[PDB]
Each structure stands twice: as C-alpha cells, then as structure tokens.
Design a protein around this ligand. Sequence first.
Ligand SMILES: *[C@@H]1O[C@H](CO)[C@@H](O[C@@H]2O[C@H](CO)[C@@H](O)[C@H](O)[C@H]2NC(C)=O)[C@H](O)[C@H]1NC(C)=O
Ligand SMILES: *[C@@H]1O[C@H](CO)[C@@H](O)[C@H](O)[C@H]1NC(C)=O
Ligand SMILES: *[C@@H]1O[C@H](CO)[C@@H](O)[C@H](O)[C@H]1NC(C)=O
Ligand SMILES: *[C@@H]1O[C@H](CO)[C@@H](O)[C@H](O)[C@H]1NC(C)=O
Ligand SMILES: *[C@@H]1O[C@H](CO)[C@@H](O)[C@H](O)[C@H]1NC(C)=O
Ligand SMILES: *[C@@H]1O[C@H](CO)[C@@H](O)[C@H](O)[C@H]1NC(C)=O
Ligand SMILES: *[C@@H]1O[C@H](CO)[C@@H](O)[C@H](O)[C@H]1NC(C)=O
Ligand SMILES: *[C@@H]1O[C@H](CO)[C@@H](O)[C@H](O)[C@H]1NC(C)=O
Ligand SMILES: *[C@@H]1O[C@H](CO)[C@@H](O)[C@H](O)[C@H]1NC(C)=O
Ligand SMILES: *[C@@H]1O[C@H](CO)[C@@H](O)[C@H](O)[C@H]1NC(C)=O
Lengths: 50, 1011, 50
Amino acid sequence: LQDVVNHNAQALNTLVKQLSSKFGAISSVLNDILSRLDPPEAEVQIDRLI
Amino acid sequence: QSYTNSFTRGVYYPDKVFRSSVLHLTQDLFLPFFSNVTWFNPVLPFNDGVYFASTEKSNIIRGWIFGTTLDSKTQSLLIVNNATNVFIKVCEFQFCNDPMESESGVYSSANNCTFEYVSNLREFVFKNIDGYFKIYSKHTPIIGRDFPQGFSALEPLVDLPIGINITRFQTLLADYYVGYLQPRTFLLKYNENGTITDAVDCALDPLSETKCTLKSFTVEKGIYQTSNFRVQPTESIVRFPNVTNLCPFHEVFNATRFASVYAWNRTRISNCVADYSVLYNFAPFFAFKCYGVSPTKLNDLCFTNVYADSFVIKGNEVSQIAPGQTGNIADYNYKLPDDFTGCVIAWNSNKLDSKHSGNYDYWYRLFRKSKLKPFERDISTEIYQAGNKPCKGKGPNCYFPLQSYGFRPTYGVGHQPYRVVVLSFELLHAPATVCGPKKSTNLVKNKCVNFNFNGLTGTGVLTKSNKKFLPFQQFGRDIVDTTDAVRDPQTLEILDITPCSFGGVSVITPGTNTSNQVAVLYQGVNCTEVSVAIHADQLTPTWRVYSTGSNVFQTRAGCLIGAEYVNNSYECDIPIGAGVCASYQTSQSIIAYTMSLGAENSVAYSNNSIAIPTNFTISVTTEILPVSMTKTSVDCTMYICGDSTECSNLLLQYGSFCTQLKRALTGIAVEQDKNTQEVFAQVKQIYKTPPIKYFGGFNFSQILPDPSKPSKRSPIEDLLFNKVTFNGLTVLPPLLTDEMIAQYTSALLAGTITSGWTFGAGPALQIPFPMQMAYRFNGIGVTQNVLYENQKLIANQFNSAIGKIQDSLFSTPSALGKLQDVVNHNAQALNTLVKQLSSKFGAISSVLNDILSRLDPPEAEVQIDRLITGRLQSLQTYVTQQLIRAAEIRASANLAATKMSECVLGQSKRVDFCGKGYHLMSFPQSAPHGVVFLHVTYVPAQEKNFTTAPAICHDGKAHFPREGVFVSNGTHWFVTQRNFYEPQIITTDNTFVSGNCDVVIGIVNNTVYDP
Amino acid sequence: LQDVVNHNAQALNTLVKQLSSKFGAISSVLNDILSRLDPPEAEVQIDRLI
Ligand SMILES: *[C@@H]1O[C@H](CO)[C@@H](O[C@@H]2O[C@H](CO)[C@@H](O)[C@H](O)[C@H]2NC(C)=O)[C@H](O)[C@H]1NC(C)=O
Ligand SMILES: *[C@@H]1O[C@H](CO)[C@@H](O)[C@H](O)[C@H]1NC(C)=O
Ligand SMILES: *[C@@H]1O[C@H](CO)[C@@H](O)[C@H](O)[C@H]1NC(C)=O
Ligand SMILES: *[C@@H]1O[C@H](CO)[C@@H](O)[C@H](O)[C@H]1NC(C)=O
Ligand SMILES: *[C@@H]1O[C@H](CO)[C@@H](O)[C@H](O)[C@H]1NC(C)=O
Ligand SMILES: *[C@@H]1O[C@H](CO)[C@@H](O)[C@H](O)[C@H]1NC(C)=O
Ligand SMILES: *[C@@H]1O[C@H](CO)[C@@H](O)[C@H](O)[C@H]1NC(C)=O
Ligand SMILES: *[C@@H]1O[C@H](CO)[C@@H](O)[C@H](O)[C@H]1NC(C)=O
Ligand SMILES: *[C@@H]1O[C@H](CO)[C@@H](O)[C@H](O)[C@H]1NC(C)=O
Ligand SMILES: *[C@@H]1O[C@H](CO)[C@@H](O)[C@H](O)[C@H]1NC(C)=O
C-alpha cells in the first residue's frame, strides 16, 4: 500500500516538475515567452512547449 | 530474333557496401523476373538501363554504341573491346566499324571526344543514372550453349562519370538477348563471402510479396496480411461553374500612379481568371515573394476574396514588410495578419513613381493615435498628441506625422522607390469567383475518377444524390467531416462523393515447403467490383491471379480468388473470416470450406436412462505457461546520443524522461524476478528425491533429475531446453540461474511424489505413492478400492502416457509455441528499437557523428533535436509495449503460481483447470522463461447404457442411495458409484429412507435387502 | 456489452475526427497543401500533419 501511494505521489511530482522543462525551447514559463518575443516566433516556442 | 523469358537474370550489386549473410530489401532499377526478352543492326531505344547478354564464340560482338541521335550531332558513347583493353570513348561520331587481322576500327568522325578510358554468356547491365554510366559485367564463360535458368549476380565492372543523355543504343560487330529495366523492389540474400546467392522479386505473384513482407525466402502455412488493394482512378474530371476571362491586373499594375503606403487602395477582383504569368515578364517586376501560397501553382482553387494593396515605399523598406513584423510602418502605417496567405510583389519604380527632380508626395504615417490591427487602414492625419494637455504642433514631442520621401533618380539603390502590390486572398470561402481556365468533363457515371469540383479535389465515385440541398449550400459533409456530397453550379446537380473502393488484400499460402500456389482475399469487397477492376487494369496490386471459372468466391469477408469453394465441411486450417477456412488438399490445390464446428452427437436422453463408465484412462496433457521475460535495461543517453556530450546537453532539457524510462525498465526487471520467485519458490526447503526410486510402478524418470548429465535437468527438461532457440541495450541475466530453477522444480516434484500434497500446507508428511493416488481418487468421487484393485495397469497407463509426452515434445516442433512467441516478441521489439537508430526522422543523417562533423553547433542543434525526438518516441513506444507485455506476463505468472499452488501442491476440484478431465495430480517442468505442467487427469471411458430410477420403494417407503446411483441391467437393480461402474446389491447400508411412496415422480418397486 | 461497443465506436470516431485536426499546420487535408505550396516548403506542413 505504501508503494502504491508512493507511486502515485511520484507520478504527480514528475508531472508537476516537468512543467519546468524547457523541452528545447526558450524557457519553461509561457508568460515570459509572451512578454519577451514577437507573436509569430512565440507561437513556435509555445508549440514546442505544448 | 524471338521472345524468351528472363528467368532470374539481371541481378547486380546495388552498392559497394559489404553485407554478409543477410536478407536485404532494396528498391532500385532491376530486370523484373520472368520479363519478356528480345533475342536477336537495329537502333534499340535505351529504356533507362538495359540488360544485354551476349552468347557467342566467334567474338563478333566488338562493343556497343549509345546515344540519343548517334549521327555526330549529340554526344555518343563508343565502347570497343579489341583483344586486351576496352577502349571507351565519349565522342561525336557519324559511324563506326559497321560497313588474323581482318578488321580495323575506322569510324567516321572523332569531334569533341570528351572522355577516354582503357582497362561466353557475357552479361552486361548498362545503367545510366546520376550522370553515371554504370557497367555491371558478369563474364561467366559457360562451356556450352545450354542457356541455364539459374542465378548469377553482376559485380560492378565500372562506374564511368560520363554524364551524357542516352535514349537509343545499338550493338557493334566486326547472338544476344536484350531486356529492359524497371524500378522494382528486390530481396537479396547476401552470402557469407559477400555474394548475392539469390534474389526474390516483390511484384510477381502474391507469394513473392509475402516473401518480401516477412523478409524471408520460406514462408509458413498461414494467412498473411500484406499491401492494400485499391481501384485506381479511371479518369480525371475538372468541373467549374460558367467561367469568364477578364484578368484586370496588367491594366492596373501598369497604371501611371498607385497610392502611398498610408493611402493604399483595397482593390477587389472578381469574376476573372488568374492570368499571372504576365506579371513575371509582361510586367517584369523582380521582387515576387509569395508567403503562405508558393507561386506557379496559381491555376485552380486559387482565390475567393482576393484583395490587392498598393504601397509606394523606399528601397530599404520592403524588408520590414512581412507577416508578423513590427515597427513604425507596422505600428501606424499598416499591420499584416500572421496568417497572410498571399503574395508580396515589389519593384523599383524610378521612371514611373518618381519625378526627375524628385516627387515629394509619397509620404507615410510617421505617427498616429490608433494601434493598427490586421487588415486596417490609417486615415486620420491630425497632429499626433503626445502630452496629457491637448497637444497641437510644437511644444511637446508632437510633430506632423507626414514626412516627404526624396524620390530622386540620383539616389542609390537603397533609396530608389519601390512600388508594391500585396495580394491578400483567403483560400477558404466555399463559393468562389476567380481561377484560371481548365477542361471540364461531364458526370463520371459511377466511375472512380479524380474529381476537382470547384477546388474540392479528390478521387471518388460521383452518383446521383437525394440529399435536398437548400439553394444556398454548396458542399455537403458528414459527421466525420468528410464531404459526402458536392454540386457544381454549372451542372447544378447534387451528387454524392462515395470514395473509390479499397480495403486490403491478404495472401493465403500453404507454406513454401509444402507448395507454391497461393490464394488472395480482397477484404470487404464485392466480387463483381474486383472482377471489373481486374478487367479494366485498375487494381493497384498489379500482380493478377487468373480469374478462371470456379475460382472466384464471395464471402462476407470479401472476395477470395485462387481457391474454389467446396460445400463439404472441415475443421479450420487457415482462418479467413465469416466462418470460411482455406486449406491445401489433394491434383493438389487450395480449397475454401465452411468451418465444421466438430462432429454432431445426439445424446440419447430418456426418462430413465443413465450411462456409467466401465473403464478409464490416465491421460497426461502438457500445458505451457510463460512465467518471465528477458530483463532489458536501456541506457537512455547512449541510445539517444552516441556518447556525444553535445547531444547529451540537448537531451538534458527534455526533463526526466530517461529517469522515467529507467525506472519503468527496472520495475519490469524486478517484476520478472518476483514472477519466477513466486512461481517456483513456493517451497521452503529443497526436498531431495530418495536414493531408490521405486514408486509402485510409476516410472518418474523423464521428470526426475538424472545426475548422469550436467545441469542436473530431467530428460524432458533437456528436450524443452534444446527445443527453445549492442548500442546501449543490455540483457540483464535472471537472478535465478537455470540450475537453481531446475533445483526448485526438482524439490517441488520430489515433495509431490514423496510427501504428497501435505508439504504445501506445512511440514512435509511422507506417504507411499500408491496411498497418495488412492487419496487422489477419493478426491474425485472414485472409491480408493479402484486403485489397489487395478494398480499395475494404472501404472502402465501412466508410464506410456508420459512416454508419448516426449514424442509430443520431440516430433511436434511447435509444442512450445507460447514461450517461443514470447522470446520472438522480445527479439522483434529489440530489433525494431535498434533498426530505428538508422531512421533519419526528417534530418540530415541517421548517425550523430556525421552531423557533428558536418555543421556548426547552432545549425546542428535542429538536426540533433529532430533525431532526439525520433529516438525518444522510439524509446517511449518500446517501453510502453514492454510494460503492456509485462502486465500480460504478470497475469500469466499469477495463473502459473495459482496452478502450482492448486494443481501441484494439492488436488483441484475446479473443472478443466488442471487439465481436461478429473484432475489427479500435476508436475512442473522448467523451460526457458516459462513452465510446463504435466496435468495428470482421470478420463472415464467404455460407457454402458443403463436403466435408472431416482428412488426405490421396498417397505412402502422411499429409499435413496447414500452417495451412489440406482441403476439396472434390465432385471436386477444395483446401487453404484456414479463415476465408475461398480454394481452393488442394494441394501440399507448404502440406502437411507425419507418419506413414503407417493411423492417421488419415478420411484420403482424393488427389494432393499438386509445385510 | 453496450459500454464495450460504445467505447470501440468512440475510439474509432475520435480517430477519424482527428483527421480534421490541423495539428498546427496550414490545413487538415493533404490535397490542398500539395496544390498550394511548393514541395520544399510544403514538406514542413506535411511533416507536422504526419
Ligand atoms: C523407467 O523408464 C525408463 C525410461 O526412461 C526405463 O529405462 C529403460 O530401461 C531399459 C532396460 O531396463 C532400457 O532398454 C531403456 O533404454 C531405458 N530407457 C531409456 C530412455 O534409456 C526404466 O527401466 C523404467 N523403470 C525404472 C525403474 O526406472
Ligand atoms: C535526351 O534526349 C532525347 C532526344 O530525343 C530527348 O527526347 C530527352 O528528353 C532527353 N532527356 C534528357 C536530357 O535526359
Ligand atoms: C506595361 O506594358 C508594356 C507593354 O509593352 C510592357 O512592356 C511593360 O512591361 C508593362 N509594365 C507593367 C508594369 O505592367
Ligand atoms: C489609388 O487611389 C488613389 C486616389 O488618389 C490614386 O492616386 C492612386 O494612384 C491609386 N493607386 C492604385 C491605382 O493602386
Ligand atoms: C454485388 O453486386 C451485384 C450486382 O450489383 C449484386 O447483385 C450483389 O448482391 C452484390 N453483392 C453483395 C454482397 O451485395
Ligand atoms: C416421460 O414421462 C412423461 C410423463 O408426462 C411423458 O410425457 C414422456 O413422453 C416420457 N418420455 C419418454 C417416454 O421418453
Ligand atoms: C480398460 O482399458 C485398458 C486400456 O485403456 C485395457 O487394457 C483394459 O483391458 C480395459 N479394461 C479393464 C477392465 O481394465
Ligand atoms: C442406449 O442408447 C441407444 C441409443 O443411442 C439405445 O438403442 C439402447 O437401447 C440404449 N441402451 C439400453 C440399455 O437400452
Ligand atoms: C444382470 O446382472 C446380473 C448380476 O448378477 C446377472 O446375473 C445377469 O445375467 C445380468 N443380465 C440380465 C439380463 O439380468
Ligand atoms: C408398488 O408396490 C405397491 C405395493 O406392492 C403397489 O401398491 C404399487 O401399485 C406398486 N407400484 C408400481 C408402479 O408397480
């Protein structure tokens, strides 16, 4: 049971941590990309993050 | 000259790369198998490479001539072989040797010789490709004129970089066969020494397409999925509404004056044609960049709401004009949408948009108090207020937002004015109004045709429709958003767009070893449709099985060709669908029959009729169960990145994917270890079988370990073991060595055969085997007296039963099908994973080191990223597949553990769980990544039809057997156990009384004796 | 059983409905992309749809 709980917790923690992965893009936060670049290339960066 | 068949000739080495003992599938220009070959001074046209096989003994064939004209006008290739050295020239000659020391080369012309070169059954492949004349020469001097229908590869004699055009060629004299090549696909079997010992085409016969599909030269008996058939389009219609020709552009584009960048005119064009080639040369404007819709395709489905914008700018101003751009021009002159599907045309306009002294009229909106949005014009030219107080003129930052451009003809190129046309059009609105002219065609009339209805392009069958389009709807779709109805305004007729027929084809083959005939199943199609497609050369799988009579059958699965339907019934051999099955029968051919669901047996039920067996059989049946899987550990970094830190840095930005994959693989591995632990290690203490091994006639030699061999495995285990069977991927060894697993099996079996089932419920309790078997009879409703009264026979019944098991595992090679399937599945997964390392994934190359040593790292980053994404999706797919397979094997291992707990460590009352019959006992045997259970079952036999009755009325009261059944042989009545005929005289010992003789439906008068 | 049938039908319906998904490309139909763009540029859109 403890292993099941730990597995679910680890899955959720990995999912939230991977919100900070750049995934080969400029950054990991959408707002900085929006208020850093022009909308066209920002679209490609947001596409990679998505 | 006649026509013969190219049996297997024309195979050459496709490349100079060594390959050993492989089956490589390559697509290239080849001589197709069994093609028609002309056997012969004619001028043979050079069909993109020829196979020329000269058979001679007088050396009459002195060489070849190639070219397009061969009359000293275009460059022609002359090849001659005099006695020692091949003179190869690329000259421009009128004629040649054609009119010991009986002949010499005089030719007729030697102009512009651009290239020079010197060095029976002479085969020569001449392939002209990529500026190369590749000559593949096989000089196998056969001693004799017998033309062998055999195999001989053609090693590349030379690859001349002549780089000339060749359409025709002739032979030079002082017989021969000619065949023409086509682009085909071949399977070549490269031998150890590097030689192509055999080749298999991929377009002749269904059989030699499944040979390519499995990448083998010997296919097994079975239905094989293969390529998908599809009726190819017959014609190609292009229907438009009534069209008109106006083209009102050049008269506008040529005009004396356009408007400024801020005063631009949105010119609307409608009801004309896209005569745009004039804008290239008739109005020769140089700057032509089409964004969203590249040019030279502007002939149909082109414009719906085309608009034209007229800009007048400087020279160094078009650069800022692009979709998604920003700047003062973008801010306050005009703003473009990001999705601008149009064209930008710019050209210098000195003599037509400038004054000789300079025209100070083309101004621009320097400032404005309104943010520009896509497709909006600036009109207000009031002073741009820049202060909180009302700002008019000077004072605050305000200035007049209109600066004159000095369009002088004396300025440089960077200042010369540009006239610009922006064609902004939307390729969407369904109703149209403008594109170029094209041929129209009437209704296809139920014909699979390329349709081009008002720009809606596709392939389909256009039939009369009953769908009531209200007089504004042009298209008509379905819930799947597929256009199932269209109507051209010119015809104004609603017609549906049911697509061209397709599906798949599957090859039924009885195995290459058995035979070579095949059948084909076009899945889900009417046989009339497929026959019609055969007739008018429309089926994509160009190989045509001859549709003779009594060989085309229409099943609910589709159309089966090559096998006749027989109204007889047989067990299924090669499943097809809808209950039909095909098989090879004996003169010998493939037949399709309705599957017979076993025999039909009517049980003779009656009001009073029972059948009790008088004999039995100790059957031994093998049941194979996967227990484990190959533990595979994959190094994410090395697989994705070939020990490259440059690639590792890029991989590090992809989150903890490698950590997740490693965790999943380690979980799978520890799960495999726990699976074999739980299946085999259910015994606390390793039990040793006794020194003397007499078990009341029960043999137990093929299952008990024999010390006179290594690894201490049983002979059955030996047969099972002998019967089964880089780049960051590692196969971790199992924790339990095969000897340890065999020792667990030996302990389990020794405990079973010595202590009975007691060792599974606690301490092992010794008990003679003839007593344990009597208990196991008691456990299936058979009195123990049966065993001792028939001990020895049963022993033999067991012993022979085990003996056949060996042959069942010896003669039959597919007995261990499930375990070998598991092994093959793992091997195929690993093979696919390593093979996808060679996939470019839309990059420059499949090898990292090339990309590293080809480009600067900023540019190489994109290619490395594409390769990383491809290989990472490969890893994720492999890991997910492994997880699913591991879950399946976990279920199988749980079943195996349950069986060993219930079938081996005890006797199970669950029906058909430990065999087919009444379970007696079971024996485990280790096998590679699995277990094999020798389920011992009691099976009754030798029936005897008998008369019965639920109750006996002796003393005016009912009587019932305590555990048996009341039966009779006509005259006497006997109470007997219900699983073995043991008649007994009815007495109060076996009978109990309950009630009187007026409630039982079928009570019978009789005597219940007193003992 | 009805849930099993409906689940299979929903899976197939989703699979065919995502044929109309642009996937961040010009369009969801290959035919239009082919007869709208030169093959070097159309390669990117075809790759995205693929
Ligand atoms: C049990 O079965 C084995 C068979 O595996 C018997 O061994 C055979 O013995 C005879 C002579 O006694 C030989 O001719 C055979 O070659 C043996 N079989 C094999 C496969 O080699 C054995 O006799 C049986 N009985 C006992 C008590 O072991
Ligand atoms: C080669 O020359 C022939 C001469 O008739 C011509 O038809 C063909 O188009 C040419 N093609 C090339 C340049 O390969
Ligand atoms: C205008 O028409 C003349 C006709 O001779 C042509 O030469 C010229 O290139 C045209 N220019 C434009 C911009 O259409
Ligand atoms: C647009 O209209 C204006 C009206 O003054 C005119 O001067 C200009 O030449 C026109 N430009 C065109 C024809 O695109
Ligand atoms: C195939 O077509 C024929 C003629 O249209 C028709 O009679 C037959 O019923 C069709 N087959 C099936 C299975 O519907
Ligand atoms: C069994 O008995 C019933 C009594 O109603 C009778 O109808 C039926 O025919 C009998 N079955 C036989 C004689 O096979
Ligand atoms: C029962 O069957 C066996 C073989 O299956 C046979 O040898 C035997 O004679 C039969 N009868 C008895 C009474 O065992
Ligand atoms: C057993 O059944 C058959 C029919 O299958 C029948 O002919 C026979 O008479 C029955 N047995 C007896 C004891 O009558
Ligand atoms: C029935 O079984 C008895 C057993 O004693 C035997 O004597 C008799 O011959 C058998 N047959 C008939 C028709 O009674
Ligand atoms: C059974 O025996 C009793 C008394 O002997 C008699 O009354 C009854 O009718 C008998 N029943 C049958 C079915 O013979």
